[PDB]
Structure 1
Amino acid sequence: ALDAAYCFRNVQDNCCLRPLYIDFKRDLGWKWIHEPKGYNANFCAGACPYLWSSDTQHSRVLSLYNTINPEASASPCCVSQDLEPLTILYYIGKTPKIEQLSNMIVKSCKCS
């Protein structure tokens, strides 16, 4: 899979998971989140050659098309596949609010 095991050890040009730890206040200016302080959001990025982790028939055909006609800018894109939720605690004045946000962390990628 296009995951941490395959992708983190050594960076390649093709679509792969890329590490990204986001600090809420440092990176986004969001001071309202009390816990956690940050999380591993990660991101997907990289080229999508013919049949490289193709999502649909459309991805397959377009990866071929892009190889023959790169100028058209029609390549499939490296995007999230598997994601995980993240629970946060924030305060509304003096009210603790717990919220489980879905699809916050990317664990794998694909060419779509």
Structure 2
Amino acid sequence: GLECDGKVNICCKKQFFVSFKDIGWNDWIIAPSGYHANYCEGECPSHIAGTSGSSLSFHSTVINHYRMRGHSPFANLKSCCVPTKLRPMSMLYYDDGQNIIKKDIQNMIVEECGCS
């Protein structure tokens, strides 16, 4: 996907450092202390609706069929800058099961952004 930079106002990927101390979950999360989660933000004008960087999925291609030619409700449904690919991250934490757990938690890190 696109990453933000000087003069990029459309949907793009930016950094976002998560501190577990800062949000008060350092009591249950042992490791890591904080990590690069990233995030997505910016305008989704119609000429990039549904895209994920320089790819357009098959699903997004069907939706754009309807949107390009103004069918309802697809002509109206807004397009939003959102993660389209995320990665898991190993975490060590206290869980209710009563104990300390290590496991890959899915969907922790934004790898690619796209327009819904």
Using structure 2 for the length normalisation, give the TM-score: 0.70
5+ residue gaps, structure 2: 52-59, 71-75
**Of 20, 30, 33, which residue of structure 2 is paired with 1:34?**
30
Q: Which has the higher strand share?
A: 2
Q: How many residues align?
A: 101
How many Å apart are 1:58 and its aligned residue?
2.9
Return structure 1 stretches of 4+ with deviation > 4 angstroms.
59-65
Distance in 2, Cα, partners of 1:60 & 1:16: 24
Q: What pairs up with 1:96-107 in 2 under 5 angstroms? A: 96-107=100-111
Pick the aligned partner of 1:16 from 12, 35, 40: 12
Question: Displacement, 1:43?
Answer: 1.1
- Tell me the SS of whatever aligns to 1:13: coil
Calculate the TM-score normalised by the size of structure 1.
0.72
Q: List gaps (5 residues or longer) in structure 1.
A: 66-72
Q: Which residue of 1 aligns with 2:93?
A: 90
**Please, what is the CA RMSD of the aligned residues?**
2.9
* Bigger share in helix: 1
Aligned-partner Cα distance in 2 for 1:85–1:34: 17
State whether residues 62 and 76 of structure 1, in contact with CA within 8 Å, keep that contact through their aligned partners in structure 2.
no
